[PDB]
Design a protein around this ligand. Structure first.
Ligand code: NAG
Lengths: 32, 37
């Protein structure tokens, strides 16, 4: 195995995957 | 370039090789670029 990364209300995400890359987007909203 | 290592057709980069171990031959389907099995 290859990859490793350790780093230091409605929560919304979008996960997209293309060209061997996983894009992640993130939003937040203070409120079914 | 079919079951082992595929490059996309918008490539910006350089390809290098010089003179100096298995390789896949049977799988179900193609590959997407920059993906491995
Ligand atoms: C992704 O992996 C699955 C394994 O179930 C395979 O069926 C699929 O064909 C793979 N993707 C491509 C583009 O071959």
């Amino acid at each position: 195995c290859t990859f490793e990364y350790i780093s230091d209300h409605l929560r919304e995400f979008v996960f997209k995957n293309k060209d061997g890359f996983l894009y992640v987007y993130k939003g937040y909203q203070p409120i079914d | 370039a079919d079951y082992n290592y595929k490059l996309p057709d918008d490539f910006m980069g350089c390809v290098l090789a010089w003179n100096t171990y298995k390789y896949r031959y049977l799988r179900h389907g193609k590959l997407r670029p920059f993906e491995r099995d």
